[PDB]
């Protein structure tokens, strides 16, 4: 029955709460301070603008397409909820809780996406000054960490099929895990105690394995470098002609496949195992 348009809600607006149920619709809503939009099962919000002290709740079976989050606003994608092509600007936060799903999120300068407690995000775009945080059962797939962008894979966080482009950075902490990371030219992946598997490092890209960190099954293509620091470990690295594995004193590598023209640099004698 219900279906709203160009409604502004919150503070000293006409209405404070907006609720959506099965079949309801909301378009170009503007959520301002004290404003709450609740998108419930079978509800659909579209083009919602979320400003300081405004919140959009996406509950189970709810859907929110093209929400745009600004300075001090919040999108909560709860269990069973779905958010598509969300845009997060300076000071905006999208949080994906247990059972929630975000697809195609664009995170802009100073914007934050938190994927926690078993939420999932696919195809996040992490641009310059943007940040993505993944933790405690949260899983992110096909994140593009673009120039200026940063992804934090924290304890219990998991990232798959991440792509790192020019000055894009991925930080994998203790208890964090990354799989099938692609490091393009200018990309940096840092294992600050965390684990990586199935990394590919193309020309200009770098993986840095620090204390407690561990890389498995890494391919270093021409111009790529895996850099292993003290008490970092790597295994099953293949170094292609023109690529490099550099191991600092006290770092370790094993099951190294060194192709002809692949550089290996060691600073201790028992550093690398072929
Ligand atoms: C919208 O859906 C229901 C409403 O009566 C119309 O279908 C409620 O159950 C919900 O709480 C929400 O208000
Ligand atoms: C944003 O401002 C709102 C508005 O001024 C009405 O009091 C508050 O309700 C919010 O809590 C927030 O401070
Ligand atoms: C949207 O409807 C929900 C629905 O009744 C699911 O039980 C409510 O839980 C929300 O609070 C909102 O009214
Ligand atoms: C939310 O309501 C939905 C609605 O009837 C159709 O979109 C159901 O699909 C869900 O099962 C839930 O009750
Ligand atoms: C409500 O609308 C959503 C969206 O705004 C459509 O572009 C759909 O994704 C849902 O299926 C529902 O129809
Ligand atoms: C909902 O409305 C949005 C609005 O024009 C924002 O200014 C569009 O950007 C979306 O494409 C959608 O149609
Ligand atoms: C959306 O509805 C949710 C409800 O439990 C689904 O059954 C709430 O948990 C959210 O806070 C919001 O009201
Ligand atoms: C909302 O959460 C789930 C969602 O519909 C997933 O399709 C289901 O457990 C229920 O429909 C619930 O109302
Ligand atoms: C709410 O609509 C979503 C739609 O794709 C958003 O545009 C669906 O994916 C959800 O399953 C739900 O129907
Ligand atoms: C919802 O709007 C989005 C728009 O960019 C938000 O400003 C589109 O990207 C979506 O495809 C949809 O039209
Ligand atoms: C909007 O205000 C936000 C915050 O409320 C300031 O304390 C800033 O973080 C944003 O940068 C923007 O100015
Ligand atoms: C979505 O639902 C969540 C729900 O209570 C989890 O069980 C809330 O944490 C969010 O605030 C939002 O309402
Ligand atoms: C949270 O949301 C749903 C819950 O049982 C009812 O809102 C489940 O479908 C999800 O798997 C998650 O547990
Ligand atoms: C939002 O969540 C959908 C999930 O099935 C709940 O409706 C997925 O199809 C998507 O992750 C969409 O982005
Ligand atoms: C997030 O918590 C959900 C919720 O607490 C209900 O059990 C679970 O369904 C999920 O499995 C996840 O752990
Ligand atoms: C949001 O999370 C979804 C998860 O299955 C729970 O709905 C994924 O399927 C989507 O790809 C998105 O990450
Ligand atoms: C990216 O630009 C942001 C700006 O506010 C967007 O309008 C800053 O908040 C960031 O610090 C960064 O410079
Ligand atoms: C979701 O789940 C956890 C919750 O605090 C307790 O189960 C944490 O991992 C996150 O902080 C988030 O609240
Ligand atoms: C998530 O969507 C992405 C989309 O094109 C936005 O950049 C794809 O590239 C991913 O493969 C995934 O489908
Ligand atoms: C991307 O550009 C950001 C700037 O805020 C854009 O407005 C910088 O903060 C980053 O260092 C990067 O150059
Ligand atoms: C990852 O960080 C999460 C984030 O700070 C909000 O929950 C926590 O949930 C985890 O405990 C972990 O540190
Ligand atoms: C958040 O909880 C993670 C999850 O429960 C299991 O991977 C915990 O192991 C961590 O303590 C993290 O802080
Ligand atoms: C990565 O490219 C960025 C791009 O021009 C803006 O997104 C620069 O800001 C960075 O300095 C880097 O060159
Ligand atoms: C994972 O945790 C790390 C930890 O606090 C110390 O190694 C940080 O370095 C990372 O930035 C991320 O928070
Ligand atoms: C993350 O924590 C690890 C700690 O031993 C937890 O097991 C360290 O080995 C890492 O160096 C990092 O501080
Ligand atoms: C860290 O654990 C990840 C996690 O189980 C996600 O499913 C794996 O994908 C990684 O390969 C790594 O072992
Ligand atoms: C690889 O190319 C990068 C380019 O800007 C983006 O592909 C350079 O920044 C690197 O230095 C390297 O030459
Ligand atoms: C990342 O490190 C993991 C380590 O044992 C800590 O969990 C391995 O399981 C992975 O294969 C990779 O070495
Ligand atoms: C990996 O991280 C190290 C970190 O400080 C562990 O304490 C750096 O010293 C290394 O240079 C590398 O970035
Ligand atoms: C390298 O540094 C790690 C620690 O996190 C630095 O504070 C340790 O876990 C290692 O055992 C080693 O000291
Ligand atoms: C291997 O090829 C690299 C890459 O494919 C693009 O230039 C070169 O950078 C190296 O010099 C090497 O010849
Ligand atoms: C191994 O092959 C490299 C080739 O360019 C791979 O693209 C050369 O650069 C090396 O000198 C060696 O011949
Ligand atoms: C590489 O470092 C490893 C790490 O420090 C764990 O103790 C050692 O196990 C290896 O012997 C090598 O020194
Ligand atoms: C080892 O073999 C390399 C060969 O071309 C790989 O196909 C040479 O480039 C090296 O110089 C060396 O002969
Ligand atoms: C590696 O070789 C060293 C040797 O004396 C010189 O190559 C030893 O110092 C190491 O313990 C290890 O045998």
Q: From atom 5 of ligand 23, which residue's Cα is the shortest distance away? A: 147
> What experiment produced this structure?
X-ray
Asked if 217 contacts 196 with a C-beta cutoff of 8 angstroms, the reply is no
Which value in Å is the resolution of this experimental model? 2.1
Number of compact structural domains in the chain: 1
Q: From atom 3 of ligand 9, which residue's Cα is the shortest distance away? A: 63
Helices (H) and strands (E) in the chain, counts: 0, 38
Whole-number Å distance between alpha carbons of 222 and 248:
20
Q: State which residues form the domain around 139.
A: 1-274
CA–centroid distance, 189 to ligand 35, in Å, is 31
Ligand 8 pocket, residues with Cβ under 6 angstroms: 41, 60-61, 80
Tell me the HSE value of 86 on the side-chain side, using a 13 A CA sphere: 36
CA–centroid distance, 247 to ligand 5, in Å, is 52
Is any ligand 13 atom within 6 A of the Cβ of residue 80? yes
Tokens of 235: 């295994």
Whole-number Å distance between alpha carbons of 215 and 167:
21
Tokens of 51: 């400003």
Q: Looking up tokens 């995170």, which residue turns up? A: 107
């Amino acid at each position: 029955k219900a279906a709203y348009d160009n409604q502004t809600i919150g503070r000293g607006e006409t209405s404070k709460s907006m609720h959506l149920s099965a079949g309801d619709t909301a378009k170009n809503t503007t959520i301002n301070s004290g404003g709450k939009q609740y998108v419930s099962s079978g509800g659909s919000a579209t083009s919602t603008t979320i400003n300081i002290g405004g919140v959009q709740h996406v509950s189970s079976g709810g859907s929110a397409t093209s929400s745009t989050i600004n300075s001090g606003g919040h999108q909560h994608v709860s269990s069973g909820g779905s958010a598509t092509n969300t845009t997060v600007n300076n000071g905006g936060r999208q949080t994906v809780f247990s059972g929630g799903s975000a697809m195609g999120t664009i995170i802009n300068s100073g914007g934050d996406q938190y994927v926690i407690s078993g939420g999932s995000a696919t195809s996040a775009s992490v641009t310059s000054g943007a940040r993505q945080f993944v933790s405690s059962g949260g899983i992110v797939k096909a994140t593009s960490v673009n120039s200026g962008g940063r992804q934090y894979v924290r304890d219990g966080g998991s990232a798959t099929d991440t792509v790192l482009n020019n000055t894009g950075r991925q930080f994998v902490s203790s208890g964090g895990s990354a799989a099938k990371t692609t490091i393009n030219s200018g990309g940096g992946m840092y294992l600050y105690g965390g684990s990586a598997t199935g990394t590919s490092i193309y020309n200009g890209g770098r993986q840095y394995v620090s204390s407690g960190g561990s890389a498995t099954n890494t391919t270093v293509y021409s111009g790529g470098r895996q850099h292993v620091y003290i008490d970092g470990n790597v295994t099953e690295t293949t170094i292609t002609s023109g690529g490099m594995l550099q191991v600092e004193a006290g770092g370790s590598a094993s099951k190294v496949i060194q192709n002809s023209g692949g550089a290996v640099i060691t600073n201790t004698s028992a550093a690398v195992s072929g």
